[PDB]
Amino acid sequence: GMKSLHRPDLYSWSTFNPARNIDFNGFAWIRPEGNILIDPVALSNHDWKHLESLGGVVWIVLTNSDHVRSAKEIADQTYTKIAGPVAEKENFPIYCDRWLSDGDELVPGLKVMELQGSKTPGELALLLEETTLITGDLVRAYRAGGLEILPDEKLMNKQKVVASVRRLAALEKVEAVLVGDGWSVFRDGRDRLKELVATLA
């Protein structure tokens, strides 16, 4: 079900993937101005009732094409708009109302960053009010307690990946790193990103 995180207006719900054996995580930011979902996996019946009670959904943000997940189903059931990465605008699996690029702010406090060198071009990462970073696939966590990157054979350009991760590690106020795949970090996120950079340096 939808669990509250390190702040009372952020939730995550997940689908276990039997093939790392790893949890695929969706995220919700609940706001009076309109709730926002990120890389949403399927919502259970309970989860829908909870989400409707919290005010529904006005935006779904997708970090990359492999994270389309249940976005189409959720859009068909609501009046939400969908935002995706501008680098994948010409061949995206679903219709998006808006294409996001590095430096955009979808709503006040939700900043967009494009990462290079990943398995898809211009994979998005989101900075929510400076202290919460949300990643799609490039930064993930199979071993609980740390942060990892996608393996080398899935990368378009490892040099660009290291540069991307350094940019994330340079975000001065990051406390939490919420990950689309695996174990999210809720405290000392900047320190976990720093350790990750050291493994790639």
Q: Binding site for Mg(2+): what residues are annotated?
A: 67, 137, 181
From the list a copy of itself, Cl ion, Mg ion, none, pick the one residue 45 interacts with, judged by a Cβ distance below 5 to 8 Å according to partner type: Cl ion
Q: 162: which 2 tokens? A: 């290291």
The H or E element that residue 16 is part of is strand 10-17
Residue 31, C-beta contacts closer than 8 angstroms, at least 6 positions apart: 9, 107
Is residue 2 a contact point for a copy of itself (CB under 8 A)? yes
167 contacts 102 by C-beta, under 8 angstroms:
no
CB-count burial class (<10 Å; 0-12, 13-18, 19+) for 166: middle
Residue number with CB closer to Cl ion (44 or 157): 44
The identity of residue 7, as a single letter, is: R
Which of these ranges, 55-63, 101-109, 150-158, 176-184, lies near Mg ion under the rule CB under 5 A? 176-184
From the list Mg ion, Cl ion, a copy of itself, none, pick the one residue 144 interacts with, judged by a Cβ distance below 5 to 8 Å according to partner type: a copy of itself
Is residue 123 a contact point for Mg ion (CB under 5 A)? no
Q: How many CA atoms lie within 13 A of 150 on its CB side?
A: 22
Query: Minimum distance between the CB of residue 195 and a copy of itself, rounded to whole angstroms?
Result: 10
| Cα pseudo-dihedral 17, 75, 59, 70, rounded to 10 | 0
Is residue 181 a contact point for Mg ion (CB under 5 A)? yes
Q: How many CA atoms lie within 13 A of 126 on its CB side?
A: 29
Footprint on residues 166-185 left by a copy of itself (CB under 8 A) = 175-176, 183-184
Residue number with CB closer to a copy of itself (86 or 128): 128
Report the first-to-last Cα separation within the chain, whole angstroms: 38
Among 158, 159, 187, 200, binds a copy of itself (CB under 8 A): 187
Residue number with CB closer to a copy of itself (17 or 157): 17
Among 11, 29, 137, 190, binds Mg ion (CB under 5 A): 137
Is residue 55 a contact point for a copy of itself (CB under 8 A)? no
Among 45, 79, 90, 172, binds Cl ion (CB under 5 A): 45
In whole angstroms, give the CA distance from residue 72 to residue 144.
30
User: Which residues of this chain interact with Cl ion, rule CB under 5 A?
Assistant: 44-45
User: Which residues of this chain interact with Mg ion, rule CB under 5 A?
Assistant: 137, 181
